[PDB]
Design an enzyme around this catalytic site. Structure first.
Site, short mmCIF file in Angstrom:
data_model
loop_
_atom_site.label_atom_id
_atom_site.label_comp_id
_atom_site.label_asym_id
_atom_site.label_seq_id
_atom_site.Cartn_x
_atom_site.Cartn_y
_atom_site.Cartn_z
N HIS A 183 3.80 3.66 0.65
CA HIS A 183 4.51 3.56 2.09
C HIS A 183 3.44 4.28 3.20
O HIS A 183 3.98 4.43 4.16
CB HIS A 183 5.61 3.89 2.18
N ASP A 268 -2.32 7.56 5.32
CA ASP A 268 -3.20 8.66 4.70
C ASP A 268 -4.75 8.21 4.61
O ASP A 268 -5.71 8.95 4.37
CB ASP A 268 -2.79 8.62 3.12
MN MN Z 1 -0.08 6.72 -1.36
#
Ligand code: MN
Ligand code: NAI
Ligand code: NAI
Ligand code: MN
Lengths: 468, 468
Positions: A183, A268
């Site tokens: 996510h 990320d």
């Molecule tokens: Mn991940």
């Protein structure tokens, strides 16, 4: 009878999120929904099972919860298998994070800041283990072969990292019905908030690989919205401050990557820049703010310790429940046990879409299949998709990723290929060629020495025999 | 009237090789073959023209030789255009090698051994200049656009480096009829000699990218011949010694790459390993023998000085010819002026194949076009081809390159893409992202400083304005 099996159900916070979402989904909160919780740690498994049962009871949900220490029993005839397991050697460790902490220190001892697993385009802590991620790869493939026999209709919902490497190897080497889940795309909502945009009035899309996704479309009121980001960069970036070590979406690093590549890296991906942003802690604080992000020698040990304390607390809370049947988990710890509110993550919406045809838009790791034309059809990418009872339907990615981003993702794809070759060949020389390409490698003898000491750690006995 | 134009005809040794091969090719040694020698250095051009005329006369060849300082005149209506030019700033330098020597020293001054242009998979000295090879790229494209107008049927035969980058950019950005030329494949004959095999009894093939080619097929007497290499590695490699700094084909480095990749790298590919073989001079001598190969701080300056002395000698020899019409160049310097023997390089066989249908097997840099299936159709690769009056015909590459070699060439292809993006975008930030991926980069400030000092060299005035 629907069977949803959680492999690693000792991840009780994640287990409780999944259980709570099921219990709060009308189409799934039924007697015929059986949730199977499986884990190799009996204390954690017991505690998770007690909390889940009490939780479900307070939500007035009739789903059945079953606990087992048998992987085969959990997989047998399952409709959906959620892999969140993090293997560890029980002779030396209590959870998987410990093997990564200890190898990272060994790496730093030999001159590799944040360990050999921290590489350009993959600084995310714990994502890979000794490059080829042997114990995590091994488990996923073992699950994949068992389910081809014992559950041929099931989806394997891979959440344990490395999601890219594991989803690719499973797909490629077993053809099992694996889908990778992350996510990280949730970072877009931070963008809309900082720019004062109603999320429902934004027309947006992201695409790329896992932890390598970019905001390829960002439109508002019938026009490109990136000029609104440009204005924020000019007027508000100087005063930006992270709220916690995980807050990087609008950091100077993110905007520096946007300047070069033309689209904003999401989630990320912002952690995974070049070494420009990561040479040392002072450099991390320049580009990520006060904390230096989460992937450093201060904040990551602080966080893994917080998670350890949480595991011990949840075990103790489970005992409290047995002693006080009348206590209300939703009242005493409403954060851990939320009520009347879905978590917002993708696993249960995915299950409800496949089984109950509740169509939803998700971001999932699946084979490209020509969606991004300059990449192979079989490479697993993180793509925008619509999911219903007819399966997964890839959106057209428009606008296409920029040329510069494409020649950014290709190296990350090649790193995946080298990691898979290091796994399947059982050949230590492959790990050596990976590190010879590492900027921190000063000599060939340095590579052998750091790998030697890693392999010789007692808890790496199985890994050592694999590569011998 | 066939017009063969040599751009850079001051490369007189190379010019004399090309002239001598033409004069010794029956189908081309005719009055209707006009050789045009063009160069910006008048002394070198004059000297080359005098030597070529006398040479051709002693071979009793009737080809016409024309000299000119006009690029347009050389290109106008040419059938074949051989680009061997090496640009330089005449205000400061006398030949191109000087700009590379001086930037390499600047790089070494800032902690980049053998200069920033020496990167993994591209250690070949002088191959690129400041990463994007601006002056050499610029000239090739200028030639390519002129010939699309003034010589639409011509082949541009690119020999000046970087052959990969230049052939790709020309093809991609102009669609001009460019073919890249390199005889690195000649290393195979060293293999056959060391293994005591009659070359005519060997069934062999190589393929890859420029300076990135591998002996994908090697068979003898109806069987794989690589076991014969294995035996040589066991019994004879310990005693191998290079005959000169260019002798690396059977070096420990070459065999160490063969061990990992499964096929033998051929020719200059052996120079282009990982940093494993190149960290410093002592490491180069371990893997390449006594000289450390040719790409080091001792042997390369020694060689560029030898070439400078040769240029001065050929100028003086040209004056001797004018003063002594009766002297015989083939007698006094038979090495420089061979008789009754082709050079063995590919340029004149190529021309005779296209024009006179003398079919021949060559190794040339052309668009993949599906020959190597795991690479894009448009990427320029160095491939085995048959050439006749109907053009270039790619051989089937069988056996396919190994998986490991494929994920070796993909990074080299990506480096080419970054080099082209650095050229066309005129964006210094692209050169900075290239060096942030360099293992020798310790900090971002180091990148800016070394590029600053390079750009500020007086002879880089045009380059500095290009990227400003
Ligand atoms: Mn991940
Ligand atoms: N995010 C990803 O989610 C995964 C888990 O993260 P956390 O919840 O923080 O880790 P965690 O350590 O808290 O949870 C992992 C659970 O998997 C269990 N486990 C380990 N090996 C197993 C096996 N062979 N079969 C079944 N269960 C097994 C562990 O006992 C543990 O309860 C990680 O891989 C991470 O990369
Ligand atoms: N091998 C490749 O072959 C090429 C030449 O190698 P060498 O013969 O050793 O170098 P070289 O310096 O001896 O020969 C290059 C020739 O090209 C000439 N030249 C430079 N700029 C020119 C231009 N714009 N137009 C026409 N001629 C020009 C030079 O005056 C020189 O005579 C190199 O690029 C090298 O990478
Ligand atoms: Mn070459």
């Amino acid at each position: 009878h629907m069977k949803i099996s959680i492999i690693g159900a000792g991840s009780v916070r994640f287990a409780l999120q999944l259980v709570g979402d099921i219990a709060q989904t009308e189409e799934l909160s039924r007697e015929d929904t059986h949730i199977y919780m499986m884990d190799v740690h009996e204390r954690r498994l017991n505690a998770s099972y007690i909390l889940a049962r009490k939780y479900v009871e307070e939500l007035n949900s009739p789903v059945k919860i079953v606990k087992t220490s048998s992987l085969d029993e959990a997989i047998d005839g399952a409709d959906f298998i959620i892999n969140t397991a993090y293997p560890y050697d029980p002779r030396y460790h209590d959870s998987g994070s410990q093997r990564w902490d200890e190898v990272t220190k060994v790496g730093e001892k030999h001159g590799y800041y944040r360990g050999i697993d921290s590489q350009e385009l993959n600084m995310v802590s714990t994502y890979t283990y000794v490059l080829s991620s042997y114990p995590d790869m091994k488990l996923a493939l073992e699950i994949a072969e068992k389910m081809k026999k014992m559950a041929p209709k099931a989806y394997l919902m891979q959440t344990a990292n490395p999601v890219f490497e594991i989803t690719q190897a499973v797909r490629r080497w077993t053809g099992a019905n694996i889908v990778g889940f992350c996510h990280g795309v949730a970072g877009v909502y931070e963008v809309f908030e900082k720019l004062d945009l109603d999320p429902e009035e934004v027309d947006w899309q992201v695409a790329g690989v896992n932890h390598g996704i970019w905001l390829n479309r960002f439109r508002y009121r019938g026009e490109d919205a990136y000029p609104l980001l440009d204005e924020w960069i000019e007027k508000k970036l100087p005063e930006w401050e992270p709220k916690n070590p995980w807050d990087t979406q609008m950091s100077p690093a993110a905007m520096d990557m946007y300047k070069f590549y033309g689209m904003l890296p999401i989630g990320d991906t912002v952690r995974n820049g070049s070494w420009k942003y990561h040479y040392n802690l002072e450099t991390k604080k320049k580009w990520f703010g006060k904390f230096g992000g989460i992937d450093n020698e201060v904040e990551r040990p602080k966080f893994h310790e917080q998670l350890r304390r949480a595991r011990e607390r949840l075990i103790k809370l489970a005992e409290e429940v047995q002693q006080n049947p009348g206590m209300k988990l939703t009242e005493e710890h409403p954060e851990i046990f939320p009520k009347g509110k879905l978590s917002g993550e993708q696993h249960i919406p995915f299950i409800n879409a496949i089984a109950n045809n509740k169509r939803v838009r998700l971001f999932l790791n699946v084979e490209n299949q020509g969606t991004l034309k300059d990449f192979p059809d079989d490479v697993v990418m993180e793509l925008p998709v619509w999911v219903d009872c007819c399966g997964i339907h890839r959106e057209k990615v428009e606008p296409d990723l920029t040329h510069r981003i494409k020649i950014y993702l290709w190296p990350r794809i090649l790193r995946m290929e080298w990691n898979l070759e290091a796994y399947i060949s059982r050949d230590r020389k492959v790990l050596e060629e990976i590190l010879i390409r590492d900027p921190r490698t000063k000599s060939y003898e340095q590579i052998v020495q750091v790998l030697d000491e890693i392999f010789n750690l007692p808890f790496n006995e199985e890994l050592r025999r694999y590569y011998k």
